[PDB]
Design an enzyme around this catalytic site. Sequence first.
Site, PDB file in Angstrom:
ATOM      1  N   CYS A   1      -2.934  -2.227   3.810  1.00 16.88           N
ATOM      2  CA  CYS A   1      -2.847  -1.572   2.646  1.00 16.88           C
ATOM      3  C   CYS A   1      -4.438  -1.016   2.258  1.00 16.88           C
ATOM      4  O   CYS A   1      -5.025  -1.964   1.814  1.00 16.88           O
ATOM      5  CB  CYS A   1      -2.216  -2.158   1.430  1.00 16.88           C
TER       6      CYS A   1
ATOM      7  N   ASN B   1       0.334  -0.737  10.203  1.00 19.09           N
ATOM      8  CA  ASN B   1       1.637  -0.255   9.571  1.00 19.09           C
ATOM      9  C   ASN B   1       1.954   1.116  10.370  1.00 19.09           C
ATOM     10  O   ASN B   1       1.199   1.766  10.576  1.00 19.09           O
ATOM     11  CB  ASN B   1       1.629  -0.480   8.333  1.00 19.09           C
TER      12      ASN B   1
ATOM     13  N   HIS C   1       3.365   4.912  10.536  1.00 17.74           N
ATOM     14  CA  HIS C   1       3.118   6.228   9.904  1.00 17.74           C
ATOM     15  C   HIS C   1       3.900   7.268  10.912  1.00 17.74           C
ATOM     16  O   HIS C   1       3.775   7.359  11.964  1.00 17.74           O
ATOM     17  CB  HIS C   1       2.028   6.665   9.558  1.00 17.74           C
TER      18      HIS C   1
ATOM     19  N   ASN D   1       6.674   4.292   7.129  1.00 17.10           N
ATOM     20  CA  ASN D   1       5.953   5.499   6.031  1.00 17.10           C
ATOM     21  C   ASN D   1       5.987   7.080   6.543  1.00 17.10           C
ATOM     22  O   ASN D   1       5.753   7.145   7.875  1.00 17.10           O
ATOM     23  CB  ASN D   1       4.446   5.049   5.785  1.00 17.10           C
TER      24      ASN D   1
ATOM     25  N   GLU E   1       6.705   6.197   0.870  1.00 10.27           N
ATOM     26  CA  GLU E   1       6.420   5.139   1.571  1.00 10.27           C
ATOM     27  C   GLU E   1       7.569   3.882   1.859  1.00 10.27           C
ATOM     28  O   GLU E   1       8.199   3.840   1.090  1.00 10.27           O
ATOM     29  CB  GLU E   1       5.253   3.917   0.564  1.00 10.27           C
ATOM     30  N   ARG E   2       7.278   3.182   3.082  1.00 10.26           N
ATOM     31  CA  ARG E   2       8.183   2.242   3.307  1.00 10.26           C
ATOM     32  C   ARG E   2       8.125   1.060   2.030  1.00 10.26           C
ATOM     33  O   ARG E   2       6.795   0.751   1.683  1.00 10.26           O
ATOM     34  CB  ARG E   2       7.665   1.609   4.579  1.00 10.26           C
TER      35      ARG E   2
ATOM     36  N   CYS F   1      -1.910   6.985  -0.547  1.00 11.27           N
ATOM     37  CA  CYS F   1      -1.787   5.622   0.531  1.00 11.27           C
ATOM     38  C   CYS F   1      -2.955   5.962   1.599  1.00 11.27           C
ATOM     39  O   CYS F   1      -2.936   7.045   1.964  1.00 11.27           O
ATOM     40  CB  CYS F   1      -0.221   6.065   1.321  1.00 11.27           C
TER      41      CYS F   1
ATOM     42  N   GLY G   1      -1.965   5.877   4.996  1.00 16.29           N
ATOM     43  CA  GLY G   1      -1.253   7.043   5.431  1.00 16.29           C
ATOM     44  C   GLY G   1      -2.268   8.260   5.581  1.00 16.29           C
ATOM     45  O   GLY G   1      -1.965   9.118   6.476  1.00 16.29           O
TER      46      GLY G   1
HETATM   47  C1  LIG Z   1       0.123   2.749   0.228  1.00 14.98           C
HETATM   48  C2  LIG Z   1      -0.541   1.952   1.208  1.00 14.98           C
HETATM   49  N1  LIG Z   1      -0.840   0.808  -0.260  1.00 14.98           N
HETATM   50  C3  LIG Z   1       0.321   1.121   2.093  1.00 14.98           C
HETATM   51  C4  LIG Z   1       1.183   0.010   1.459  1.00 14.98           C
HETATM   52  C5  LIG Z   1       2.066  -0.359   2.820  1.00 14.98           C
HETATM   53  C6  LIG Z   1       3.291   0.326   2.917  1.00 14.98           C
HETATM   54  N2  LIG Z   1       3.993   0.810   1.908  1.00 14.98           N
HETATM   55  C7  LIG Z   1       4.010  -0.169   4.200  1.00 14.98           C
HETATM   56  O1  LIG Z   1       5.107  -0.597   3.777  1.00 14.98           O
HETATM   57  O2  LIG Z   1       3.471  -0.180   5.319  1.00 14.98           O
HETATM   58  C8  LIG Z   1      -2.190   2.081   1.383  1.00 14.98           C
HETATM   59  O3  LIG Z   1      -2.418   1.943   2.549  1.00 14.98           O
HETATM   60  O4  LIG Z   1      -2.701   2.358   0.747  1.00 14.98           O
END
Ligand SMILES: C[C@@](N)(CCC[C@H](N)C(=O)O)C(=O)O
Lengths: 279, 279
Positions: free
Chosen positions: A74, A163, A165, A196, A214-215, A223, A226
């Site tokens: 994140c 994560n 995308h 995401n 977002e996931r 994000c 993201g």
């Molecule tokens: C939005 C996020 N907080 C990522 C959160 C994690 C995302 N919802 C996921 O499930 O991979 C960021 O990178 O700033």
Amino acid sequence: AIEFTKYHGLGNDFILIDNRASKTPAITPEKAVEMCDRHFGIGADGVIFALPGENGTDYTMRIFNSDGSEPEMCGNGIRCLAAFLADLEGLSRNKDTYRIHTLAGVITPQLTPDGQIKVDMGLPRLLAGEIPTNIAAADQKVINQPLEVEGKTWEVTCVSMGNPHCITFVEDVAAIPLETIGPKFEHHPAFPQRTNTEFIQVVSRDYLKMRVWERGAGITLACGTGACASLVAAVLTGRSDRLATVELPGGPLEIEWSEVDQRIYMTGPADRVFTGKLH
Amino acid sequence: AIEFTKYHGLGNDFILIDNRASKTPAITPEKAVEMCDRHFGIGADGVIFALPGENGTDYTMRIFNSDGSEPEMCGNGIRCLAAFLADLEGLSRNKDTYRIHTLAGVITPQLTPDGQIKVDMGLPRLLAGEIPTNIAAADQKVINQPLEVEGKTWEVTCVSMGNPHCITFVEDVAAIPLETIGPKFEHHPAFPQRTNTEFIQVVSRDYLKMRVWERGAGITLACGTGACASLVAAVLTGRSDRLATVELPGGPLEIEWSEVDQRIYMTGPADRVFTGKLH
Ligand SMILES: C[C@@](N)(CCC[C@H](N)C(=O)O)C(=O)O
Ligand SMILES: C[C@@](N)(CCC[C@H](N)C(=O)O)C(=O)O
């Protein structure tokens, strides 16, 4: 009895818990869901734990999304955590960077003089098996590939920052019916661990406008991972340069795909809102 | 520096402020908007001030909606304030009821032994000039009257509980496109000071299912003045008895239009969520 500090990075808002006393998170995923409920709890996109370091790092970050799932990284949250850690350490702080262990690997935020935080987000992961996605073979990239969503074929590029995308480039990002189409991307069968989803309007080769579903969190105002993935996707598809502003609903991030070390750097703010204690 | 406690009454959530030191609210409406922002602030449907009593009352309540406007009363909020006051008084409390001055008059919550709060919400106001609305002459009631909204004619009943309500009875309340039609009722020219709008599905003569688009707060999970007004409207139109449960998204309220004194009594919960301090 749980004490916490509320932060947000560009309106992507988090409950930060000082968890340095134990490697066991202070709350369960189920409790995190209750705490993130905006009416019945504190209200947040996630809960971030400041945990003891592992393998030489200074600290560890774990995050629970507001749906209780645990993602691997994140970016907005890392910036909030770096500010949080600086406050916890106080005058005992002896450096401007933290090495933070995450599920995605070591991530290194740097507190910069102007109040921003610049983060070494690591190398982007480009192979389908790394996303993960079944759009292509595991050893192939996923660049401008088809994804049928409720009858309509979208052109998508997949990048992982630890994560998953899924990025699609659009003429008018404000006109995307995100509440409706977002979930259909998130849970698409092509994405075994969900994804995401970023909708990107290219304004110029150094300026991208992003909206995200977002996931595990839905529509958020920003994000970081993201934005990193979207910049990578824009380079891979020849639409942008490696240095760009990504404008999000909550404001801008500065993204650089470094030609020195091929890592992604993300610079943005982190704001402490309030401290609190659960009843 | 601002210390506050977060409460909710059936998910209608509020920031409660100890303002006993002055009759002047310690935050401006503009600051209240910032504080109610769910991503950049604390997040709430409103800010409620516990203020010094006026004219022999024990305390005064003022409330700012999340849009900064100041309504005349709030039923979920009065329950939360009663609980807040009891916590402030602690073992100095010597009674089970508070007389609370509001813009709508004196309102009297009672802390009941089972932990609920039963509120004397006063007399319902039924004349068009009391709503206010131009649907009828000022000295006439507004019962099953026409209101054209975006070309469709709705049958509406208007009741004031100190604040304006526009009630319409429907077959399937879950199917109402509330995000779309709500604002069109709220700002209809027939309502000089805007209105709260309640969509009511009659399940039985003692059970109403309600959804609400609130003046100055939008979609909320519960509204006590709205449930009161909806019960009054259901009686006035012959659809319900004077004692009913009003099921809201966040849970049920028990509403009674007393035949003893013709006043409305509203019984429901109030939950303390967390205490905090703004940075
Ligand atoms: C939005 C996020 N907080 C990522 C959160 C994690 C995302 N919802 C996921 O499930 O991979 C960021 O990178 O700033
Ligand atoms: C929902 C409400 N809090 C009333 C809030 C005031 C309302 N938004 C208005 O503007 O009159 C209640 O009665 O419980």
